[PDB]
Amino acid sequence: FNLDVDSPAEYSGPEGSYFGFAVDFFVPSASSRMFLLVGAPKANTTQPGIVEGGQVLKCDWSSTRRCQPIEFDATG
Amino acid sequence: DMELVKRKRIEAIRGQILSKLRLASPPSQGEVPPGPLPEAVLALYNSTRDRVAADYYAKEVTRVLMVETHNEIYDKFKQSTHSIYMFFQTSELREAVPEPVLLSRAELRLLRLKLKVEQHVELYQKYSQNSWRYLSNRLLAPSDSPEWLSFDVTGVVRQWLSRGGEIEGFRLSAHCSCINGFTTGRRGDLATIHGMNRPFLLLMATPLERAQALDTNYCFSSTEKNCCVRQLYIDFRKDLGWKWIHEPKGYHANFCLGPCPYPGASAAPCCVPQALEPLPIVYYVGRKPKVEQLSNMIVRSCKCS
Amino acid sequence: IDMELVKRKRIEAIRGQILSKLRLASPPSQGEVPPGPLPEAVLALYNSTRDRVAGEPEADYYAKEVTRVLMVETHNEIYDKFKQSTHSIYMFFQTSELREAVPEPVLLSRAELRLLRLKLKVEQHVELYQKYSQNSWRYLSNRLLAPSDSPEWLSFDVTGVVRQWLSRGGEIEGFRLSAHCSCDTLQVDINGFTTGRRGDLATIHGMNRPFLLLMATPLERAQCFSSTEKNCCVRQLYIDFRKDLGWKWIHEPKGYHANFCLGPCPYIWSLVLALYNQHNPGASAAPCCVPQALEPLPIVYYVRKPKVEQLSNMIVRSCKCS
Numbered sequence A: 001f002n003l004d005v006d007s008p009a010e011y012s013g014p015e016g017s018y019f020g021f022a023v024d025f026f027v028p029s030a031s032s033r034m035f036l037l038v039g040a041p042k043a044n045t046t047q048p049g050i051v052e053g054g055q056v057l058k059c060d061w062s063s064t065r066r067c068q069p070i071e072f073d074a075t076g
Numbered sequence B: 001d002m003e004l005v006k007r008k009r010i011e012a013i014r015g016q017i018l019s020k021l022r023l024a025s026p027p028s029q030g031e032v033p034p035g036p037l038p039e040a041v042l043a044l045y046n047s048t049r050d051r052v053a054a055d056y057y058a059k060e061v062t063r064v065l066m067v068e069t070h071n072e073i074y075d076k077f078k079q080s081t082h083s084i085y086m087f088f089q090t091s092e093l094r095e096a097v098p099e100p101v102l103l104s105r106a107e108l109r110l111l112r113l114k115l116k117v118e119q120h121v122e123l124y125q126k127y128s129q130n131s132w133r134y135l136s137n138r139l140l141a142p143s144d145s146p147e148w149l150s151f152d153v154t155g156v157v158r159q160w161l162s163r164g165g166e167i168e169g170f171r172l173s174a175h176c177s178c179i180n181g182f183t184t185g186r187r188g189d190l191a192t193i194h195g196m197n198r199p200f201l202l203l204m205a206t207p208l209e210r211a212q213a214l215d216t217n218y219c220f221s222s223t224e225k226n227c228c229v230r231q232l233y234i235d236f237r238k239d240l241g242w243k244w245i246h247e248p249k250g251y252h253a254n255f256c257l258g259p260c261p262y263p264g265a266s267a268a269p270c271c272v273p274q275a276l277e278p279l280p281i282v283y284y285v286g287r288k289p290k291v292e293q294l295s296n297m298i299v300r301s302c303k304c305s
Numbered sequence C: 001i002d003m004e005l006v007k008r009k010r011i012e013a014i015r016g017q018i019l020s021k022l023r024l025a026s027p028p029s030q031g032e033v034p035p036g037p038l039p040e041a042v043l044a045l046y047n048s049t050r051d052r053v054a055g056e057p058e059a060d061y062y063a064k065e066v067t068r069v070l071m072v073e074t075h076n077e078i079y080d081k082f083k084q085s086t087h088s089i090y091m092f093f094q095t096s097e098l099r100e101a102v103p104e105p106v107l108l109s110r111a112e113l114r115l116l117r118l119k120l121k122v123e124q125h126v127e128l129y130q131k132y133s134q135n136s137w138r139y140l141s142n143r144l145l146a147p148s149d150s151p152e153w154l155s156f157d158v159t160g161v162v163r164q165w166l167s168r169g170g171e172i173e174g175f176r177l178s179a180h181c182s183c184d185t186l187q188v189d190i191n192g193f194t195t196g197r198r199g200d201l202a203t204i205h206g207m208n209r210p211f212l213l214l215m216a217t218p219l220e221r222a223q224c225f226s227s228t229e230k231n232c233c234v235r236q237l238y239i240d241f242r243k244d245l246g247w248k249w250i251h252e253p254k255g256y257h258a259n260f261c262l263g264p265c266p267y268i269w270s271l272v273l274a275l276y277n278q279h280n281p282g283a284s285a286a287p288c289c290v291p292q293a294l295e296p297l298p299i300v301y302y303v304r305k306p307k308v309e310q311l312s313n314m315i316v317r318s319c320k321c322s
């Protein structure tokens, strides 16, 4: 009942990429910042010759709401 | 002798202002107010002096504010946190400027709040009430104080007064690298929203009371008795005797000759060039050939100032 | 009566003008110059300065030495990382010849990068980028395209970029040409390599490639404040409406600074054609002390309808001789 629906944080990824098909949290070493893990399985990547390989994005909560791709594999 | 010079220009200003305003004599009517003038026109006057960012007659300046986040501006957009949408009503636009030809300058002015960092802005126009077409671009600088900018959308406003479309608008998003520009979701942090002084479209048009500098394309086809640009082909071998300039061996520099009667600044308004064009030359230096370009040589147009 | 010698007053004013912009007192010697040979390399420079129909200060009155530099082909470095794709187009240049045409970065005045268009019909939109950290790309300018049925020649003022490239000893630079991004591909046909043209004519198929046109000041030149006399300098003059006009029908404003231009502008006077940048920079038959830059003035007056109007050209800022 206590979820804030007045001012929720809206994160977005590339359109048509199914951004949000899988979601999770990120809590790394020690008392650091926290992040949102969002899946976009139909997302086009920079991988050579790979069409719609998909990617997992690291979005920052701290401020600014900006998302950064996680480089899992750059090869073709 | 120094006070006699100043008195002659004033009488040229008198004849200028009356000609620019199309007035024969200053008016004299009923008088309001004995205190400070109404702030509806002081907001216009305070917005016209606010510079941050042919036709010598006067232009009547009027403005129109935008629509709130109410009035159906919420059924279509709202939540693109990296963009700002602005809408106007045509029923009030074609009232300040009846005929689209009267419109002279129509610049869209906004209000900046953020003072830290620098961001990149792209401007679009409303098409098919869904599609947006590119317009202009402008980079912004980290000014410590609230800054006031302006975008010249005259060509857009002119076409909108010819159409019967009673609903139009603009869009201000950010740079697309192939989403930046706005980092807050309130939409009211980077620009003023649902608040006074919100973005307005400053208009500068010519009244119906009024309506009711050509170059070589007129100065060479007609015989002017006034300030017209005359033709003059200058040869290096023939008119100068210079064989040290390989290219070119002659060009059209031209000149301005003509009177300019009734208009200020100088004691005698002269026939001076308005537009000039550079000339590339080729000459040698001992054994080294240098291709250089002189600035402002070819006289295109001529004005009187 | 006036007469036709006015044309000769212009010619003798052009004579002293060209020599002053080149910072020369007398024409150089041409007996140390070989008559006949004129390279087509300098003819391509002269043809590219006159070509631009498309595309968008004390030191700015003198002459600028125009030199150009072609780009690096796709046969060495432009294929090693990205090659060519429908998403972007890459152009690369050196620096050993950029810092050779313009040795010192300060000499650079205007540096426009010129390309060669092919027929594109209706519409395309182009965005230009710069190479940063040898990997990151930063926005520059944008330009909408018109349906030219014929090959067109453009130019992009990248002066601020080239100046920064001359200050660093960066041994390799280049540009990138992608298209517009509508967010919330590229269809431009520019003269390229096409990769596959061979034979005898292939060597000439590298001509007309993107080049960077440079306009700098030669090193040989280098090196009311320029005059002890009251020259054609703009004089102060404060005009009040109630005091100097007696007009009480204008509420706002109640005064402004309408200056004026006072001073003579003669030429070809006795004794070394040195001071030519203020006396007669237009080389006109009769130079006049006229305003160059003017500023509009907004006004507020009554007639039951208060009308806010703005007058064009009222405040005189500077004064020139032309």
Ligand SMILES: *[C@@H]1O[C@H](CO)[C@@H](O[C@@H]2O[C@H](CO)[C@@H](O[C@@H]3O[C@H](CO)[C@@H](O)[C@H](O[C@H]4O[C@H](CO)[C@@H](O)[C@H](O)[C@@H]4O)[C@@H]3O)[C@H](O)[C@H]2NC(C)=O)[C@H](O)[C@H]1NC(C)=O
Pocket: B039, B042, B043, B046
């Ligand atoms: C549009 O912009 C104009 C400026 O271009 C702006 O005018 C401002 O008006 C206020 C008046 O409300 C000015 O404030 C006054 O300034 C004068 C000096 O110029 C002072 O003498 C005044 O003194 C006050 O305080 C005294 C206390 O002893 C009182 O006795 C006295 O009666 C006065 O109340 C007062 O400080 C202000 O200076 C100008 N602005 C400028 C830049 O001069 C106008 O308000 C703007 N309007 C809108 C609608 O935006």
Ligand SMILES: *[C@@H]1O[C@H](CO)[C@@H](O[C@@H]2O[C@H](CO)[C@@H](O[C@@H]3O[C@H](CO)[C@@H](O)[C@H](O)[C@@H]3O)[C@H](O)[C@H]2NC(C)=O)[C@H](O)[C@H]1NC(C)=O
Pocket: A015, A016, A017, A042, A043, A044, A051, A052
């Ligand atoms: C990821 O990138 C691929 C390309 O690498 C995108 O696939 C492309 O999808 C478009 C349509 O979505 C295809 O274009 C279509 O062509 C037909 C003509 O046959 C035309 O009528 C359609 O209107 C449309 O333009 C395009 O061919 C296709 N590209 C390839 C190489 O197959 C995909 O859309 C991208 N996805 C995301 C989420 O970015």
